[PDB]
Design a binder for this molecule. Structure first.
Ligand code: 1VB
Length: 353
């Protein structure tokens, strides 16, 4: 009988680790994506199944763009590979770009749920040691990501709170509960490659609770089937309200808990666009980033800076104001795009209610 060592984590961090590895959380997310958890339990999810789903979506995409299989037949194959639940009615045929991308996105999220399950598999060294860490220590250790909870008077704390408050929704701004500093080392080496590149900004990235463990383990990633209104890159926002739209939170007790990242992004020379371009795979030549510019932007006259690893990083502090040059943009709020994973380092994780 092995000893369970006492937990080293503070209460807030124990809660985070409980939440981002929660089996209920993961199954709730699968239900929210219309998956049939009975047919596709967490422990049964595999990389092969996910890869087969992407092959089925690739066939669908080719059909959508002959005498090949019907969209219904090809949809049926996808739905056999990745079981869905629509209260035991037929699932719907995947017959639009929008629905195709929504299934790609679902699988990208499912891939990160499978990553978290794979991470948790018990190693052989763990079966042999006579003492084990507390389970929340074990789970924290698996991330290979240093988290340090910040208190009120950490130098950046007020700056981050201000960014959240001034750029979050005016009527029901998310309520800040915790901030952690995030150090995923060996993001370090690849990030140091952009050390010459100025124009760094701290930007919001909101996400599903179900992908937080994966992000902490592996950083923000660009995968083969990722897409959106500015193409195949990593998406950020300068307005918390925009990123908060992507936060899938979870009911815990009387409240709704969600997580948002702050990334330091080396934007370099910006290419500004004012119309959607879902086909982009890089900036144009001589540019380091693409900014889909919104009707509004956090008032640039109120920008401050933080010093992170000896570099100045801009942090907006202003309420959003109108930008006359982009009053006719297809974007209400800006989307900031990088097309190399190396141009972002995770810096902070916020718990918001
Ligand atoms: C489908 C899901 N996408 C998101 O979570 C997008 C979240 C998001 N989109 C934004 C778009 C514009 C501006 C801001 C954001 C943002 O803050 N989050 C996703 C989840 C996981 C992955 S992975 N496993 O390839 O690293 C990729 C994509």
């Amino acid at each position: 009988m092995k000893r369970v060592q006492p937990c080293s984590l503070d209460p807030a961090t124990q809660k985070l680790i409980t939440n981002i590895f929660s089996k209920e959380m993961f199954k709730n997310t699968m239900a929210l994506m219309d998956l049939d958890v009975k047919k596709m339990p967490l422990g049964k999810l595999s990389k092969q199944q996910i890869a087969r789903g992407f092959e089925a979506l690739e066939a669908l995409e080719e059909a959508l763009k002959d005498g090949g299989q019907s969209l219904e037949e090809l949809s049926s194959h996808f739905y056999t590979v990745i079981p869905h639940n629509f209260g035991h009615s037929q699932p719907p045929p995947i017959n639009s770009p929008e629905l195709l991308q929504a299934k790609k996105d679902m699988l990208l999220v499912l891939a990160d749920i499978e990553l978290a399950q794979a991470l948790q598999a018990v190693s052989e060294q763990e079966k042999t040691v006579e003492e084990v860490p507390h389970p929340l220590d074990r789970d924290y250790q698996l991330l290979k990501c240093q988290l340090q909870l910040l208190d009120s008077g950490a130098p950046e704390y007020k700056v981050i709170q201000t960014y959240l408050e001034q750029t979050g929704s005016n009527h029901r701004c998310p309520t800040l509960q915790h901030i952690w500093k995030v150090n995923q080392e060996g993001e370090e080496d690849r990030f140091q490659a952009h050390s010459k590149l100025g124009n760094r900004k701290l930007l919001w990235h909101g996400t599903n609770m179900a992908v937080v463990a994966a992000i902490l383990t592996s950083g923000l990633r660009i995968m083969p089937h990722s897409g959106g209104r500015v193409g195949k890159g990593i998406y950020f926002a300068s307005e918390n309200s925009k990123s908060a739209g992507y936060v899938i939170g979870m009911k815990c007790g009387a409240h709704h808990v969600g997580y948002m990242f702050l990334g330091e992004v080396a934007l370099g020379r910006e290419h500004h666009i004012n119309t959607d371009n879902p086909s982009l795979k890089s900036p144009p030549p001589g540019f380091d980033s693409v900014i889909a510019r919104g009707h509004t932007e956090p008032d640039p006259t109120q920008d401050t800076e933080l010093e992170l690893d000896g570099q100045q990083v801009v942090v907006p502090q202003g309420q959003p104001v109108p930008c006359p040059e982009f009053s006719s943009s297809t974007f209400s709020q800006s989307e900031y795009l990088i097309y190399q994973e190396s141009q972002c380092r995770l810096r902070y994780l916020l718990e918001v209610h």
